[PDB]
Design an enzyme around this catalytic site. Structure first.
Site, PDB file in Angstrom:
ATOM      1  N   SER A 172      28.009  -9.776 -39.443  1.00 45.83           N
ATOM      2  CA  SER A 172      28.175 -11.115 -38.944  1.00 45.83           C
ATOM      3  C   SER A 172      27.109 -12.027 -39.567  1.00 45.83           C
ATOM      4  O   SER A 172      27.339 -13.222 -39.787  1.00 45.83           O
ATOM      5  CB  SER A 172      28.040 -11.103 -37.442  1.00 45.83           C
ATOM      6  N   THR A 198      25.243  -7.747 -36.487  1.00 48.60           N
ATOM      7  CA  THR A 198      24.403  -6.907 -37.361  1.00 48.60           C
ATOM      8  C   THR A 198      24.484  -7.574 -38.703  1.00 48.60           C
ATOM      9  O   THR A 198      25.485  -8.235 -38.995  1.00 48.60           O
ATOM     10  CB  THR A 198      24.958  -5.392 -37.512  1.00 48.60           C
ATOM     11  N   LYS A 234      20.464   1.333 -38.564  1.00 50.73           N
ATOM     12  CA  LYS A 234      21.650   1.033 -39.338  1.00 50.73           C
ATOM     13  C   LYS A 234      21.558   1.368 -40.788  1.00 50.73           C
ATOM     14  O   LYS A 234      22.473   1.079 -41.553  1.00 50.73           O
ATOM     15  CB  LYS A 234      21.968  -0.435 -39.177  1.00 50.73           C
ATOM     16  N   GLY A 280      23.739   1.637 -45.694  1.00 52.00           N
ATOM     17  CA  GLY A 280      23.673   0.893 -44.454  1.00 52.00           C
ATOM     18  C   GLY A 280      25.097   0.755 -43.975  1.00 52.00           C
ATOM     19  O   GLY A 280      26.033   0.857 -44.767  1.00 52.00           O
TER      20      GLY A 280
END
Lengths: 174, 174, 174, 174, 174, 174, 174, 174, 174, 174, 174
Positions: free
Chosen positions: G124, G1, G33, G45
């Site tokens: 990531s 994500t 998200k 988020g």
């Protein structure tokens, strides 16, 4: 072990401690980690095996015969053989070698490195030495030898694998 | 760190170095690893955390109030609490504690050990110290203090985690 | 195992224990770790394979024939072949070899080492021997032999891998 | 597997079980782990691969032809080749071999070991066998064979990797 | 380290940083990661041994002489020997090489790779450079050089292994 | 990160860098690692959680109110609660705190430490700072501030986790 | 994500992808998200568990009621509880939260971070997004939303754990 | 990467994606993983190194010259060399190769596998592709190509290491 | 996989399943694990590479031609070359081979094994087959075939790596 | 340990071996792994700790009092408590329990499993037992007890952690 | 295991297999993984402890009574207690639950997830089911049931942890 090389005013030195560590114990305190090569025109220090070094330094003098004392060229021929040769590949050391021309590092990874001001600091204590050497070079008028020495002692004070036994080799070309 | 206790002729000592190591570097060189407890009637050294020790030694003086200076009994009450208590259990140290009665070791494992001649040598350098202490006790007429000191220096020479800064506490009951 | 060499007053010894371990048990208690060489002019101790030994010490004598008793030179030759020869490379050991000239260590790495005062202490019990040998050497008049002995017992008393079976090879010269 | 050799009154035996284990299961229960070599003048047992053993025992008879049945010498030549040779080096076994002269162990580490009373106990069950063999040798007038057998069964009872199938080879020279 | 190549409007660049790292410290801050080749008709950047580089780029030029500037072909030949030659196999690096024809990567695996738009971003800081190069390439009129630059600084700003010392080798053709 | 405290001539500083790292990338480059406390009579640097910090330094001031500026005492109280309180125990950091009285470190272990010459160097770049601070302190007349500064840059130049953004909090008293 | 927040000209956005990965497979492609909190005055988020986030965001609105919308203060109270509370401690997420006042990150490590230009890129794919966002902010006149979006897609192109499904929340205070 | 081969009605195809992943990032999105060999009479796909594949496919065409296009025979000769040859052994790939005769897989483990209906699905996404291919083959009248394509996209949707860039090679013998 | 051989009343069978696994998925469900050899006088099953197999069984037949059907001898020759030949050494498998003479196993280690009652059960499902084969063999009159079968199904019912596709090769002789 | 339960013709049994293994050695050979509970109306076997079992079986009889001998219900209440309760959670065992109603397994994972024909085979030897039990149930008219026994012995023959000491409990309701 | 839910044309199913695995063997082949709830208005499948299940599904029904059939709400409540309650936290499973309203997943993390098209595929065989369900759903007119079925068989055909025993719970509403 910590090995420091400083170069200032036509004077270049290589200083190293003398601790040999086995696990968590001192095996020897006066290892000679610095020596002379090529009719004394070259100074050198090494981290790691003594015999390992002996073999690599011998070959280096050899490569030097083959390139008329051209430090760098002979330096690379060694970084070349060192990674290729099936035998040398097994050797493990960290070479620091200097002459009036320039100072440099030689790794088994086929690397020849020439740090920022010919300032070399290899070994578990390398960084601590470098840090002190740096501070001294840029804030005092001290000699190469004085710096190498005071730096090495500092390293020795911080690094658990470096002691206070020294060996120094100097070279004057002024 | 190395901590040595020797007892000879109504004289018992506890000596320790002063190195604190963080990874492969010396963080502090003059750590005070030996101190006095219970109106100076008790000497003690510790390997590990200082605050950890402070807490364990405090409790020990306490247990001592509860057993009229009976070293051993109070020693076990501490080896007892130390392993039971949810808080103490987390503490990590190696206690060496002595008085005119006897010398002993106290571990978080609920252990109270009284080595062969009240000769204690704990710490990464423990064994080296013990070995020298042993050699000296059985072949010279040296004092407890002289042995503790010469032993500790030897340890210091061999053990990469022990230095030459000392702290000694002595007790004379002759 | 533990091998201790000690040279004091025209006397130089090598003493080793006899424990052979495998895992956590004793396979043999009387291994001969110290033998003689070069027409009994040279003494030596070894830590490692019994056959491994037999091949190295033979080669050594051989090298000695090629350098007329010049301990060091032969020693360097041995350490030289040892790290080169494809067969010898697989051999693993720790020779401690000495004569009236000097005492020294040879490691499969190709290193020939001369410890501070011809004091050698190799093997897992190595440092505990050293620690005690040092303490005796610097605080008593005891003979070279007596030290190796006492040191070795102390080693065996601490090291779980060293026992009290001894083998001593002395050498008088003055 | 457990292999026991006992020698008493001009009678030397070699006994071994017959379990082959794969992971946590018995693959075979009657493996023949003991056999005869060199015109039946030599008895031998092995821990590990059968084919591995077959190869090592063949070579041994060979080395024996080359040293007129001198057990020990031929034994070392094998401990020699075994560690040197690029092929043999890959072999994995534990040899126990005896004759009227003496009993000994032969490892891939270039080792030839002759335990205290020619008493050999190799294999995962080795120590248990040794312990019983020892007890029996020093407290009963039992034969070599009786001991080897009773010892091996005890091993078999304790060691999860040793069973009760036996193979024995005896040698009488009285 | 970070090497970024970018080709826009008859201009193609290769830009790299100068950090040499060892463990968690900076060994050198000014390494030359981008050089020129084939009589300065070809540009190239490399991540890896300085000598390693010197051997590969030489061989490359050599291969170029054998395929008259045909970038790709020589490139494939190099990647061909690189994974075959017993000496070259041990060499480790990451060449980014390019000319007016095309830009491409050569990996010791023997791969010659041509990324989507002659956009190359190799090295630990690789993707952060790519990410920014892409963003600039697709949303601004900036020149190939300006992009490599800005991209590289951004890389150096994120990657702990990349710094702000640059080396750029441009090439105009149209 | 790197925090350096240096006290020379009625001047005592605390200087830290601003790098926040996560994995191998820089999350933030301007973190404020050095603040003021106790009505600006006390200075302090911290390595760790920004909120973690905010809770510890608050508690500290609180402890200072309870011991009228007695740096040490409050410091010990803080280190005391820190290892006891079930909430505080989970907090992780490294406070470097100091005033005209003395300089010192507080670790979640509960330790209050006073380094050799009020010279503090905490953080991954810690020792490289120390090494250079020591070298400057012992070979130049430079001011406490100037040293922390220069030392810190040197730290940032070696430590991959330390940058050149600084925060300094001085204190004059004499 | 990957979650990106950009703030430009009285416009602040928070964009995130929608990939949920289980091992090496996509479990869900449209995870939401990003969401709104506190009467829509706050955008947010999160990286990690949805329910985990739900719990942390609820508490945050709560802390906000307790500090009259003061983002930062309420932000720290949450970084406080999050590390202390026995239950929250077990939660695992990475919060990115913004309002007209400022943007910031909130970690379970009791950290509240406010990157250089209110530019946030967590997940990531964070760094890749950051790199593009940076390039765009400093070389184009694009809106916050345009950057967040183009950055996120780039991330999506490079990061194997980020897709191209988006959710954006914007806030205009101009 | 995912590679799918389907064979239906005198039509056999091989489809593969084009993602190359380095760690957790996409290095290249258009890798050509499928190609033609042997005067276009053979189709083939590969998982892994491109150059690795290039070498293995070349050899395969070769083996094909030696067996008059007999797919299977030449296929095994390659599975033969591949595991024997000291050089090929080092290669790492997964070959999927087909012709009008039959389809099969070729692994470095000296394996040649011919799945149930000439349905091949290798690669991290293999199983997902296979699952969809299976569903489609047994419930629709779709062509080989249609299945390979729709299957591959599904794989692409689930597998984090497979994208949507395709390369297809078809063969019609009807 | 699971291979079961069973010899009862002048009938000897070899039965194997057909599952080929890779990771946690089934690559093939119908592998042929049992074939015939030596002009169909010999039967055999194999666990391992399909090509690996093809090379071993060929060599076997070859060895059989050299020892006129003498199962065992050829078997020993095969196991002999298998562990010697530099090419064959890399091959990995598990042959179960048998004829009217005897049944036996050949392992790449060079072992030829003859299990208790010509009952062979190799493969991950091996022991579950054995367990059931033994139970049937010792408590029912069922035929050799019927047992291999039933045993194998039971194996396939427990072993996650074994299925219900069978291949049987019988042999009548009496 | 292996525990087998078979149910046939109004007869249900539970058989188990008696080996207790410590590492690689047999600690006890006659452990009683099967017993009676609830006024003898229930039979039960357990793998693991004896005291652990004692505690779990006691509780089970208890739960049985609370559900009027309803095996299953009381069985689940135990699988319930077992995973919830802070104390029970630490217990480690594998329960096999039967009555005239049905047989079932009870794991600490809050699982109650009722295998296909009330056939239970738990323990390291479980599968081997199951395999034989299966073979026997479906091909002989043997009693539950005969099967349990013959199965258990087979297990015992294959499993290195199961011996031949048995304990059986039977239940007849016919 | 594999659980597949599929909703097409006023029909929604949940289908699961029956394999229970332990290590590498099958403990049970007929586990009931799909049941009914809330007076048979709701269907559900579960992967995990059989008792674990029994506690969760009960609680669910309970939550449904508290929100009059409002699937989602009850679902969120369940996921809410599940991650909070000290008892429920230790429970481990994967519920797939659905009714005419909607289909969804509940994970012990506290997540309630609604996959793209009410298509659920949980369990190790999850994705292989998904892959095939997707392919059928998008290329055939097949009924929701028929898909779950076919998908599930395909799953069982690939997943070593999934078999062909099914349990289906349909639901018609329109």
């Amino acid at each position: 072990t910590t090995i420091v090389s400083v170069r200032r005013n036509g004077h270049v030195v290589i200083a190293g401690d003398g601790q040999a560590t086995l696990g968590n114990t001192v095996m020897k305190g006066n290892v000679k980690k610095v020596r002379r090569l090529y009719n004394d025109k070259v100074i050198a220090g090494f981290a790691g095996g003594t015999a390992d070094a002996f073999t690599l330094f011998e070959l280096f003098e050899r490569k030097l015969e083959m390139h008329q004392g051209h430090l760098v060229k002979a330096a690379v021929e060694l970084a070349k053989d060192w990674r290729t040769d099936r035998m040398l590949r097994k050797l493990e050391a960290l070479l620091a070698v200097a002459d009036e021309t320039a100072s440099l590092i030689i790794t088994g990874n086929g690397d020849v490195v020439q740090p920022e001001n010919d300032l070399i600091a290899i070994g578990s204590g390398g960084p601590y030495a470098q840090a002190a050497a740096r501070a001294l070079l840029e804030n005092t008028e001290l000699s190469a030898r004085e710096i190498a020495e005071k730096a090495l002692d500092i390293a020795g004070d911080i690094c658990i694998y470096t002691n206070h036994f020294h060996t120094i080799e100097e070279l004057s070309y002024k």
